[PDB]
């Protein structure tokens, strides 16, 4: 029943910056623990008993606090530190977690490399048509994709998703799929994905012509 409130919800730090996140409890706690979680993996015990580091954790991490006030600090932000951090307590019968602090590495701008993929003949033979646009290794995360078919703007028939920040180069990638019936795909020629991003002085268009091998 002890509520843990973490702050900030989201933060970005440049390499070498000192990072501090906080966990405040609704009632006094004897010890605070912290877990790190990265995309597609179980949470890892990172700090325990308020200020002890699990084996393998870099010494730039530290933890502190007492009573209702705790905090985790990285002396010098590094790319591998980008992740979600959860505080955790078990000073009463019910174990509780904070809602997490999502920590991003703030790097230089990187323009996406843009690639377009027509539907495969296998898919077309199966009876559906998907066109895919990849925006690879860009920063910051904000990016816009517009699909055009014979210069018709497509609205509502695409979906997209984005990877978590890369642990090495701190970039994002984004995949967008435009869904068409086979008949619609086969009755149009030019398929384009137009990308807007801070690293591009003007929107960039990658296109292909259906039927051109």
């Amino acid at each position: 029943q002890i509520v843990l409130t973490q702050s900030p919800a989201i933060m970005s730090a440049s390499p070498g910056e000192k990072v501090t996140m906080t966990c405040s409890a609704s009632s006094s706690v004897s010890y605070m623990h912290w877990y790190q979680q990265k995309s597609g993996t179980s949470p890892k015990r990172w700090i325990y008993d308020t200020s002890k580091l699990t084996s393998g954790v870099p010494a730039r991490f530290s933890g502190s606090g007492s009573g209702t006030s705790y905090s985790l600090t990285i002396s010098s932000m590094e790319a591998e530190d980008a992740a979600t951090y959860y505080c955790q307590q078990w000073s009463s019968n019910t174990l509780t977690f904070g809602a997490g602090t999502k920590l991003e590495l703030k790097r230089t701008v990187a323009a996406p490399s843009v690639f377009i993929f027509p539907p495969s003949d296998e898919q077309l033979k199966s009876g559906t048509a998907s066109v895919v646009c990849l925006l690879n290794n860009f920063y910051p995360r904000e990016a816009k994709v517009q699909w055009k078919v014979d210069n018709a703007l497509q609205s509502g028939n695409s979906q997209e998703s984005v990877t978590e920040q890369d642990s090495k180069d701190s970039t994002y990638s984004l995949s967008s799929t435009l869904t068409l019936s086979k008949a619609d795909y086969e009755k149009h020629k030019v398929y384009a994905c137009e990308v807007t991003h801070q690293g591009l002085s003007s929107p960039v268009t990658k296109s292909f012509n259906r039927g051109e091998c």
Partner: protein, 211 residues
Amino acid sequence: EVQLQESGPGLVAPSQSLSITCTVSGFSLISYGVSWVRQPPGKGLEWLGVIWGDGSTNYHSTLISRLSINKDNSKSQVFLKLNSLQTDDTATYYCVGPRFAYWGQGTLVTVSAASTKGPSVFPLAPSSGGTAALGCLVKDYFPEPVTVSWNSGALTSGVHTFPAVLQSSGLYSLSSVVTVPSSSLGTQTYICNVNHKPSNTKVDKRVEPKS
């Protein structure tokens, strides 16, 4: 070392009870407690309960009426049972060993009346000293998750496997890509290995430049 492995249904109908097994190794279940934690997609961590060495149990107050945890010490097995299911019980469920320092890999359980469906895997062929991109589209499967590797794990550098999207049909679609030197497209073989455990559907799809 201490290991905890979950075995779970993947898809479960809301008319059923969710049942998950956690097989442990490396520590005594008679001496140490084992906890269950869950994480809905895109959300935080929630502790469900614990079974202690002597068999006593503690549950999260909000869910105490729905949860039951038991165990078999001789088999080193812990059993979670969640009743009164709703779609919002869809989550990754973890068993957690002593000191909360060892976690299972987690099993994604989906609560739905829909049926399981394995994916179709289509190539994203590299377009016709230069970087090229290729990939595969894992289309029309249910429930989550799908895993993707490349060349049986021999190819990891440059790989991006994206979050799945839920199509209007109620089926998921996922893409995985990799960037490689353009000069390798004619001499290296690229295979994406797709596993949809909820349907026991596995595919290995070769991706090559179009002829």
